[PDB]
Symmetry: C5
Subunit: 103 residues, 5 copies
């Protein structure tokens, strides 16, 4: 079991760590059918998605997907610094797999 | 996959972007039968709803509809600036499909 | 579809609006059996309830009832001004059908 | 329907009101199997639990038990003043039936 | 029924108490498949997980696992002092069973 985001991220193919150390600049969420997703940006232009739940997801991921959107909204509203994101780099925008918050 | 609200909104019919760049002026929520909904207004008079779930919605939207009402409530209470809303313009008041927040 | 709480309230018999323009003074919550409910009071003012779900609540209302209790709690804690309540006024304390928040 | 915690508490057997008029001193929660519970304390030594869901609960009470733990956590974190607790006094620690909050 | 985290922790095998008396230094969470977990750290290097839900958990522990991740996230954001953790010491990082917050 990994003990940090960077080691977690290394367990997966097509992932990488983005180091932001910054608050979220914008938070966008949609309820439109087939686009039940969130999108975040940082002021450097970095853009990330929480993907719409789908066949690339297993059942254990559904609750975690909803939690991640919860986390992004509250981080946004509190202006919490995001340390790192583990993202899938084979999607545009890159898709979030994990987040770390630290000063 | 869209990277912002404007591109997402353009994937649907009968939708438009309203640019508010303002906090929500009032938040109304109802539990009354057949009107289980939320209504928001802005100081310019713009009024929007999250629709009562109905025949126009699918199962994959159910959680997202509940999430949007959560997001509007906490945006209202915290005075969070709403950047844009994507809305269906064939409902009165216009019905929210997506929101973006940015300072 | 109504665009404000007053018009919504006018769609139902046995309701009225109370105009409060004040924060909630006290919040009471019970998990005791058959009293799973929330009660709010306004300073030097009235008490209101969210009814226990039962016979006279249809099924889409169950989530809305839970949401309303969540709304009253967060309003109380954040000290947000309640603008108006739409209530059923056939018993004391009057039962909440809808809430509006505005400054 | 009772309009305050004291009158609510009087509808049950083996309950009583403790008056605190104080913030929560400590908050404890557990996910250990068969001990999925919460405990709170006050600086006068008063200690209360939210019981593990069990045979003594009817099914409407499950959501309410979860709500109470939500309430106690955010009360603790925000240092919200707890006015009174209605508790079952046939358990150690006394088990929470209801709470009232007032500043 | 225990009245505190230490006595709760002593009801189980392979558990121990870590006394921190400090805020959380970092909070990490993941939606990646088979690693739907949270990780927290403290400035002294202590690292703890909320385990991926699995065969070692009963249904009552499921909601409690989700609650604990909620608790850790808001504790982190609010700089809440964590008093103690009860953890399983047969997992690496040690796996949280219970938390207490005080002071
Ligand atoms: C809306 C938009 O188009 N914005 C882009 C940025 O891309 C968006 O955000 C990124 C994170 C992805 O989600 C994109 O899909 C999304 O459109 C764009 O950022 C660069 O995007 C690249 C996409 O492949 C890549 O992620 C890149 O970073 C990696 O590659 C660069 C070299 O180009 C460096 O080697 C980086 O170190 C490397 N990072 C990692 C973790 O491997 C992104 O660029 C990096 O992030 C930017 C936010 C910015 O800080 C860059 O200096 C940095 O290199 C940027 C590119 O400038 O433009 C638009 O803002
Ligand atoms: C409670 C009430 O009746 N309030 C009205 C506004 O209508 C409400 O809010 C709007 C946003 C919709 O949700 C309505 O269903 C709702 O009742 C009303 O706003 C205008 O509403 C029009 C629909 O009836 C329409 O949406 C219009 O915007 C479009 O058309 C205008 C012409 O008026 C312009 O061409 C706009 O560019 C165009 N916008 C887009 C994105 O397509 C709304 O008017 C605009 O928004 C207003 C809030 C205000 O800023 C206007 O200056 C602006 O044009 C307003 C209209 O005055 O009156 C009450 O406030
Ligand atoms: C961890 C621990 O053991 N703490 C105890 C206190 O007990 C804990 O908290 C109480 C509220 C219960 O939930 C217990 O289950 C729990 O372990 C203990 O408080 C007294 O607890 C009694 C029950 O064991 C009882 O509730 C008592 O108050 C009642 O009785 C007294 C005299 O015995 C008076 O009649 C009170 O009016 C009566 N209260 C009511 C509402 O009927 C508790 O003591 C009262 O509250 C204490 C917090 C404190 O302010 C006392 O001065 C006050 O009498 C205390 C006190 O013995 O010891 C440990 O802190
Ligand atoms: C990322 C990393 O490698 N970090 C390690 C610490 O381990 C992490 O945190 C601990 C709490 C566990 O969850 C690990 O699984 C996790 O990787 C590491 O902490 C020590 O970890 C040991 C188990 O691997 C063990 O728990 C130890 O505590 C016990 O043994 C020590 C002496 O080594 C003392 O006797 C303690 O009293 C005893 N504790 C109990 C409750 O029985 C951990 O060390 C303790 O906690 C540290 C955070 C630090 O304050 C030490 O002074 C203290 O002894 C530390 C060890 O330095 O290194 C990395 O930070
Ligand atoms: O998914 C919700 C949407 O469904 C469409 O059919 C309708 O025209 C929109 O106004 C909106 O209700
Ligand atoms: O509903 C929960 C309650 O159930 C009662 O029967 C019991 O006597 C109380 O102590 C409390 O457990
Ligand atoms: O309930 C969860 C616990 O299950 C036990 O069997 C195991 O020893 C612990 O590591 C922990 O996973
Ligand atoms: Na009416």
């Amino acid at each position: 079991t990994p003990q940090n985001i960077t080691d977690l991220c290394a367990e997966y193919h097509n992932t990488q760590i983005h180091t932001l150390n910054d608050k979220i600049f914008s938070y966008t969420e949609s309820l439109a059918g087939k686009r039940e997703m969130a999108i975040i940006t940082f002021k450097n232009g970095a853009t990330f998605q929480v993907e719409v739940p789908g066949s690339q997801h297993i059942d254990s991921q559904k609750k975690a997907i909803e939690r991640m959107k919860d986390t992004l909204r509250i981080a946004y509203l509190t202006e919490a610094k995001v340390e790192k994101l583990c993202v899938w780099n084979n999607k545009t925008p890159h898709a979030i797999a994990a987040i770390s918050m630290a000063n």
